[PDB]
Design a protein around this nucleic acid. Structure first.
Ligand SMILES: Nc1ncnc2c1ncn2[C@@H]1O[C@H](COP(=O)(O)OP(=O)(O)O)[C@@H](O)[C@H]1O
Ligand SMILES: Nc1ncnc2c1ncn2[C@@H]1O[C@H](COP(=O)(O)OP(=O)(O)O)[C@@H](O)[C@H]1O
Ligand SMILES: Nc1ncnc2c1ncn2[C@@H]1O[C@H](COP(=O)(O)OP(=O)(O)O)[C@@H](O)[C@H]1O
Ligand SMILES: [Mg+2]
Ligand SMILES: [Mg+2]
Ligand SMILES: [Mg+2]
Ligand SMILES: [Zn+2]
Lengths: 614, 638, 651
DNA sequence: AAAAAAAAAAAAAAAAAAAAAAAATTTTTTTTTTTTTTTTTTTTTTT
């Protein structure tokens, strides 16, 4: 119970006189500039930082957290009232809604009669004239909650949760303010929408129609009405924060406006937003009372961990001649040895360069075939955690529709939508397929098609589509033409006992068990964040093969093909592999031209991978 | 205003009796201490023992168990008054306090099949298995509204009429002011309580074999919502009532009955564990810190003779190693996997059943009785919302526990391959297009396999006698070949032990009678001395309960490898990999990989935990080395 | 439960402002003292002066006047809070403390005719006469029930939904328990509130002539139920509202209106005069410093505008002061009321003296010879016409009880009426009875009558017995009978003419500018506050055009009213010396030989002559504030009776 | 001063204007639950 006029004045003071040094120690009035852009219509969403609010008024932040929707509306009204005094020039009428807004304001000014008192139902709804949205960036003090722990005590509260996106619908038009036009009076009726559904109006309430006592039927218009991009996603508990014997819990997040098209399935997302109910009318409730479903009205969605979205010394380390070896070493440092396999996995992460002269994929596929207990699954899991877009499939737990897509009954409307499996979620990413050799034949055929065509051609009963799965494949198996012909690299890992090697491995593993970290080396291994940043910086560095390298590459190919022919499998795929591996090496070296060193390292990797087969 | 109550003799008597029962200073003080405990823990429900209530006041016990609603109302009023007396500032925080019950209910302890009309309005205790667990929905009990036109704020109060007659005026949610101004509901100020509905089914083992199951619907209000999940065995105590229908000029006699749970408790009363016992454990650890491990090993399975190394390994399993969660999220498992590959009638199955009875969260699985989705996680569709849901399997349930896989060898290769991830990294990664999940199952596997041909042919190598591939065997950190040795002396020992155990009789409880073939007495699974007395007929031995408590306390301790033990283990592992570690005529029972070094580290940590060492020393390392040496080699005769 | 307001900004502001106004401690604690006084008196209704309320906060005054129910509820909450703060136990004793209003209502002050629908839900102060009243009925505000079957005790509350939407749920009296157990109501424990309905009609002397009168229905509740009776010129301050109709289904749109009275007042002239410390000190000073001639001073200052008639003025003062009733142990009663009859020549200001008594004396009822006829004069017995029961209506004498009846044209009054009032003149009571009822109403009133002698003008050459056509039976009960002769003496005519012309030439200072006509026309009366129910005083009138000059001041009207009111309560005791003097003088007076020849008695001498001698001595003692009848008082009484009882027959 | 006539009043009886009281199950819908059928997926047997 507080004076909302006073609260509105407080938020207005904050917005108008808050400042920070975000730009090289220059007081710039952050939210003032944002308001300027909002008035100019160059910005749709405004993200208020509750950390900034608390910098001066912590109790206001507490009030917002205790009752966010109310204070969300208060901030929206404050911005609405502030826009005119920040407006500096005329809007360019970005869209049809802007045209409608200007027309309505113009004719309201025309029929103003300023002194006349207008009925409350005789004005434009506030949401009908916004063209902007206001969301809250949760305070840093608020520790993130857990989907299971967010309960009725948090209803109406600004909670921040973290989880995996298991599903997200496609952006749909959700009506905010329905508009109607009458067949008698030429006046517009408006119906703001708060319930999940609504009943369209029949008769017109316009003063003219009421006076004339005409029929005054009115027709619903999608033109003057106001819509907002609407998405419905489901976030899931992280594995590390589920109870002992419990399966992770899922929360329905509703995203609207500029927050849509930020989170896709499989992303690690931290969602700040308001926990709210939805009345459960209709259902013959078992228990009397106003029981209601729940959801999270999203305000700020951020990508976490691998889903995440430089300094002179950083550029120095990139330029350093040993940068490639540093990156190859930093991958899974707790796993001893396997320097060459680490280099191969780094190349798989970086990728080659896609060419569409007939489109030839630039992905690198690697299959670690090996003896039991040789870190195959450990490296697969490390890549799964590292690669920004990655999926992990162990055996037949995720088989069939777990790899491909399936038709599932949608919820926002109710219909057969298409949900993507592991391969789809790994699209333009990595799929780590452990226990490859034990996989079902159908899944193996699907992986075969994905490794070459980058697609999944499903023609089952309920589904007939061609999914796009542009994912590199890092498979693991234990002891072959059926795999050597296809996979870009086939790497054999045999653990042959040896006194010195086993002693070193035992020392390494014992130190790991002691200090929960890899033994110190000459160079500190790079963090997952830095590694992902460098990998991404390498992705957008497409180099090209000079005409000079043609002779050298052809000579190498013919030589290796002679070796394969003489010995007791080489093909054009071998030369393609050399090309894409060399391009990946060039990407890592930050050059636009593939070089002799690149081709040399490609051939060395191929030679050692094949030597592993013997 | 309406018809308030001026004075009520029965209510006053009930509240006075309950306040007297709760105020315990002239008495022992149990419930005063319990109220202080809940105040300290910031809760608003007290668990009151029906046995204590009956002891102090028979009349109040009968009244509470026969007319629960108003009696529980009076009890909760007394509870709030008592909490205010102890500290009013905390009593003001919570609107109401709740009274759950426990203890023994004579005829009110029933199964969903036996919960009939006779128990309507009474307090009942029902033990069963959860089948359905709806979502936790907020139910509004006090709604705050704001009128922008008049700046007024209003509060609407809705009574919990779940089982009482409700009229529409009670449930009318306000939307317009008196003069039809729009009202905006303030969610941040309104009050909601979590509400859930579950279903409790007659336990499959206790239900009659012939007929179909019987179930009961249970309403859980705040503080009792996420206490149970489908498939769990739980005890729910609450009032069995009738749910009102809906307004209608016609009605059939039928009524929909439910159970408003006042408390819910896990069947896994064994999943959880005094200063006397704590000091006893401290002295036991301190006194004989070297032979404590051996004494525990020998006392582990008293009814099974011999198998010293097998029992040592089982103790190491029950203790578990120390997991290593690295700075990069990498995971090194701490659980320990044992495969008893053995000749018929060598007590491997009995060891499995011992671990079932002893260890917390032990799940019994069989070769072909738990296939695929039943053994690991699964994905299904709700069939009502058309949405995909996870379903925990045997190992997901056994997370932070043990899975006893009898007849492991006769599992399909599909299932055995599916179990690889659980064995290695302790999780199940399952995905269908709709939903992908990474469930945690950090379980330890105790498998009981018989060799190909039925009986272990000692002339053939262990690789041949074990019909399993090296990739699978590497999963099991310890592999014990348990032969039915034909030594007459050991035969004498075993026969004497068996006959002594068969001759044993219960002390006093039995005198020549027959063991009987449950609702009459409280259910043991839910029921609330260092050494055994040296009976000559059982010994010719640490107590079971003290062993349980000591293992529980020693599980938490996290010993850290010391440099000396690390060097010793590394040298021994190098030798084990080397060829010289095995002489002629000895064959490896399982290939030695880095998995075996992890086995050594885990076994040494388990030994250090048995000793509560806080450091894994050369003693522990040597014991682990010796056990691995015994387990990983076999001498093949010609 | 249900909706419960949390932040009612208007209610909070109203409560704060009303509590600030009622604090009053810095504002010379007027309302603090009023609250303390009501606390001591054991009252639970505070009367607030709307003028003071407007002076403190004009906003609150306007809000209260234009929104009656809400602001009155806020004011009552503030009053209850203030009463608790001053004394908590009293606040807990009384559930709700009511607030009535008083003062000058600019436009809200109306009559039953001008009270239109524009005043609904407003505070209106309506003047009128109570045409009828209803029996005081108790309405249950909180009932208590006991269930023998279960020993439970429940208590139901009923809200005051008199002018609010009411539903069957609120007005159902429990008669069974939830298990169908018969209940029994505990009448002693239950809470009832007295409620009455009256009808206020526009005053006939104010209503437009020749039209039917306009009425209004008024609702009185606890502590206001019996504040008026039929025929009372009352001022009712209340809230005008529409009474809900019964649950219908079809409504004609017609709504009965009613006035929920928040305060009832009678004519302030009969109210207890306010005696401040300075006023009582001035009365003490007057009585002590001047006692020898105080009676003469008051008699001469009684009616300044009427010249001469000194003995008649003294007799009128004695009548105003009255005697003292004798309540003997055996029930026998003796009246202390003096009866005076002025008869004489036309144009001797006898009607003017009667009018002066009417204007000054409290509870003075005018009457004319034929204006009242029997049942109108004394009490009357009628029937209710709805219950079939007898009922009593108070006549002029009954209404004048403990007062004065000023009768004019007494000679013209029919013999039947004079015979009827015979009892009132002596026993001071009216004895009426019909078959279904009998009563003995109290009429303790002094009769001041005026009459014209037979033949129109007094006959100096005939006996007073023949001049006055009133027989001895009626003459005797008149304590004093004064014959006022229009003597044609040139000097007396000079004095009378000078006095009359001076009085005519006087103008009121300030209000009159030398040419004003003060008459108003039926609108200014309601525009300004009524000078009949309204709320520093000097002692001697300042010299003005009324008299030229001398070493003898004239008593102020207000001071004289206060002094007479104070002195009337005194009951001086008859002393032995005065008793003996009066007895011997009565013996001599009754012995006709004492009076000279050619002298005829105006009225016969009797035990009643002795009683009026005693009463006149008592009145003189009262005037002196003596508390004992002294020799001077007896001398004055004998002088007055001797002058009044004999007239010289000229020839 | 008394008798007769006139009228004046009181009370009782009667007839509308407005308000208040009395009387009131049956048909259709939808939701849940349960079962049946199709196709895909998985499992098992034979070569
Ligand atoms: N070269 C190595 N360096 C460090 N640890 C290793 C190495 N090889 C195996 N390990 C450890 O041995 C265990 C077995 O490796 P894992 O990859 O699970 O077997 P697989 O290769 O069959 O998947 C892992 O826990 C891993 O930490
Ligand atoms: N060493 C032993 N000590 C005690 N009992 C034994 C021993 N060996 C066999 N038995 C008895 O033989 C029976 C074998 O049953 P079980 O253990 O279920 O089969 P298996 O031994 O093949 O696992 C048990 O009832 C057990 O009492
Ligand atoms: N003594 C007097 N002094 C002053 N005015 C007198 C006197 N006598 C008669 N009058 C005047 O005579 C007028 C009428 O007299 P009134 O009161 O009618 O006497 P009555 O009743 O005998 O006719 C009054 O206005 C009054 O002023
Ligand atoms: Mg593996
Ligand atoms: Mg067995
Ligand atoms: Mg006259
Ligand atoms: Zn219209």
């Amino acid at each position: 119970l507080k004076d909302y006029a006073l609260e509105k004045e407080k938020v207005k003071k904050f917005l108008q006189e808050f400042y920070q040094d975000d730009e090289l120690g220059k007081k710039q009035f952050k939210y003032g500039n944002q308001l300027v852009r909002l008035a100019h219509r160059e910005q749709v969403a405004l993200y208020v930082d509750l950390d900034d609010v608390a910098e001066d008024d912590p109790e206001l932040v507490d009030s917002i957290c205790e009752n966010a929707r109310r204070y969300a509306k208060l901030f929206a009204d404050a911005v609405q009232e502030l826009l005119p005094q920040y407006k500096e020039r005329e809007v360019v009428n970005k869209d049809v809604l802007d045209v409608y807004i200007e027309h309505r304001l113009m004719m309201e000014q025309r029929s103003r009669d300023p002194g006349m008192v207008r009925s409350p139902q005789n004005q434009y709804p506030a949401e009908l004239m916004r063209r902007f949205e206001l969301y809250f960036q949760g305070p840093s003090s608020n520790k993130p909650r857990v989907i299971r722990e967010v309960r009725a005590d948090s209803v109406g509260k600004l909670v921040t949760v973290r989880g995996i996106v298991t599903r997200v619908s496609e952006v749909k038009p959700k009506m905010v303010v329905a508009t109607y036009t009458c067949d008698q009076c030429g006046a517009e009726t408006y119906q703001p929408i708060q319930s999940p559904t609504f009943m369209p109006l029949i008769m017109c309430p316009s003063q003219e129609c009421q006076t004339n006592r005409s029929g005054g039927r009115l027709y619903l218009q999608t033109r003057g009405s106001r819509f907002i991009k609407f998405q419905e996603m489901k976030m899931q508990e992280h594995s590390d924060q589920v109870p002992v014997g419990n399966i992770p819990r899922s929360i329905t997040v509703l995203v609207e406006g500029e927050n849509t098209r930020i989170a896709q399935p499989g992303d690690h997302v931290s969602v700040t937003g308001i926990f709210l109910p939805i009345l459960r009318t209709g259902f013959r409730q078992v228990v009397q009372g106003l029981l209601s479903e729940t959801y999270l009205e999203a305000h700020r969605i951020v990508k976490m961990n691998k889903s995440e979205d430089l300094t002179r010394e950083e550029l120095r380390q990139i330029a350093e001649e040993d940068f490639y070896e540093k990156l190859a070493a930093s991958i899974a440092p707790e796993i001893y040895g396997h320097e060459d396999v680490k280099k191969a996995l780094l190349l798989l992460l970086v990728g080659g360069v896609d060419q569409s002269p007939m489109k030839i994929r630039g992905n690198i596929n690697i299959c670690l075939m090996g003896d039991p207990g040789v870190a195959k699954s450990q490296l697969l899991s490390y890549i799964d955690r590292l690669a920004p877009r990655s999926q992990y499939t162990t055996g037949r737990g995720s088989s069939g529709v777990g790899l491909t897509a399936a038709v599932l009954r949608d919820s926002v409307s109710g219909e057969l939508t298409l949900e993507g499996g592991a391969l789809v979620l790994a699209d333009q990413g990595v799929c780590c397929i452990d226990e490859f050799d034990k996989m079902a034949e159908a899944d193996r055929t699907a992986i075969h098609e994905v490794m070459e065509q980058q697609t999944i051609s499903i023609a089952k009963a309920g589904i007939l589509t061609t999914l796009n799965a542009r994912c590199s494949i890092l498979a693991a198996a234990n002891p072959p033409a059926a795999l050597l012909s296809r996979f870009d690299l086939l790497w054999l890992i045999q653990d042959r006992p040896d006194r010195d090697n086993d002693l070193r491995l035992a020392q390494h593993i014992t130190y790991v068990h002691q200090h929960s970290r890899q033994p110190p080396s000459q160079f500190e291994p790079l963090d997952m964040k830095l590694m992902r940043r460098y990998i991404a910086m390498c992705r957008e560095k497409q180099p090209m093969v000079p005409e000079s390298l043609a002779d050298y590459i052809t000579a190498a190919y013919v030589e290796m093909r002679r070796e394969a022919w003489a010995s007791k499998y080489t093909s054009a795929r071998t030369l393609l592999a050399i090309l894409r591996l060399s391009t990946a090496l060039a990407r890592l070296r930050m050059v636009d031209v593939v070089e002799k060193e690149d081709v040399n390292e490609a051939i060395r990797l191929m030679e050692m991978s094949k030597d592993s087969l013997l | 205003a309406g018809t308030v109550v001026l004075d009520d003799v029965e209510l006053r008597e009930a509240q006075r009796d309950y306040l007297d029962f709760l105020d315990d200073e002239e008495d022992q003080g149990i419930y005063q201490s319990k109220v202080r405990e809940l105040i300290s823990d910031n809760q608003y429900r007290l668990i009151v023992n029906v046995n204590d209530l009956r002891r102090k006041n028979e009349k109040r016990a009968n009244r509470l168990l026969n007319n629960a609603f108003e009696e529980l109302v009076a009890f909760q009023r007394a509870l709030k008054d008592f909490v205010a007396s102890i500290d009013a500032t905390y009593a003001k925080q919570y609107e109401e306090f709740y009274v759950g019950l426990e203890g023994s209910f004579g005829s009110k302890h029933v199964s969903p099949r036996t919960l009939t009309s006779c128990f309507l309005s009474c307090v009942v205790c029902v033990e069963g298995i959860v089948t359905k667990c709806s979502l936790v929905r907020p139910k509004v009990v006090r709604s705050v509204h704001y009128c922008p036109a008049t700046k007024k704020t209003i509060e609407r109060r809705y009574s919990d009429l779940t089982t009482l007659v409700a009229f529409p005026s009670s449930s009318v949610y306000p939307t317009k002011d008196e003069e039809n101004n729009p009202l905006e509901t303030e969610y941040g100020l309104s009050v909601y309580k979590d509400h859930q509905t579950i279903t409790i089914q007659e336990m499959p083992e206790k239900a009659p074999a012939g007929q179909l199951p019987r179930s009961v619907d249970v309403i859980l209000d705040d503080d009792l919502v996420d206490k149970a999940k489908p498939g769990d065995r739980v005890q729910v105590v609450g009032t069995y009532r009738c749910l009102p229908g809906k307004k209608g000029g016609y009605t059939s006699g039928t009524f929909r009955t439910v159970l408003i749970a006042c408390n819910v408790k896990q069947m896994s009363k064994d999943a959880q564990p005094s200063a006397e016992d704590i000091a006893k454990i401290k002295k036991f650890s301190k006194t004989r810190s070297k032979d404590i491990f051996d004494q525990l090993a020998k006392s582990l399975a008293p009814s099974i003779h011999g198998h010293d190394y097998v029992k040592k390994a089982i103790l190491c399993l029950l203790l578990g190693g120390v997991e290593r969660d690295l700075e990069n999220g990498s995971h090194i498992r701490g659980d320990i996997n044992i495969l008893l590959i053995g000749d018929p009638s060598v007590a491997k199955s009995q060891l499995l059943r011992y671990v079932l009875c002893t260890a917390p969260r032990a799940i019994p699985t069989t070769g072909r009785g738990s296939s695929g989705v039943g053994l690991t996680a699964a994905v299904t569709t709700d069939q009502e919302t058309g949405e995909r849901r996870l379903e925990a399997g045997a190992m997901v349930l056994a997370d932070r526990g043990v899975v006893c896989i009898d007849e492991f060898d006769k599992m399909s290769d599909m299932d055995r391959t599916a179990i690889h991830e659980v064995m290695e990294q302790g999780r199940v990664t399952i995905a269908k297009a709709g939903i992908h999940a990474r469930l945690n199952a950090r379980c330890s596997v105790l498998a009981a396999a018989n060799p190909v041909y039925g009986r272990y042919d000692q002339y053939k190598t262990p690789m041949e006698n074990i019909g399993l591939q090296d990739s699978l065997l590497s999963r099991f950190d310890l592999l014990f070949i348990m032969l039915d040795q034909m030594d007459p002396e050991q035969d004498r020992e075993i026969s004497d032990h068996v006959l002594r155990m068969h001759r044993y009789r219960a002390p006093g409880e039995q005198d020549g009678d027959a063991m009987p073939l449950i609702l009459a007495t409280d259910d043991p699974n839910f029921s609330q001395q260092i050494y055994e007395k040296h009976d000559n007929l059982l010994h010719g031995m640490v107590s079971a309960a003290f062993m349980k408590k000591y293992i529980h306390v020693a599980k938490i301790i996290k010993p850290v490898l010391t440099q000396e033990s690390a060097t010793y283990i590394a040298e021994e592992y190098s030798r084990l990999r080397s060829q010289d570690s095995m002489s002629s005529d000895t064959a490896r029972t399982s290939p030695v990989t880095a998995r075996t070094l992890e086995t050594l580290i885990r076994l040494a940590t388990a030994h250090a935990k048995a000793r509560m060492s806080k450091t894994v020393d050369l003693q522990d390392a040597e014991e682990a080395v010796e056990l691995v040496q015994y387990a990983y080699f076999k001498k093949v005769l010609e």
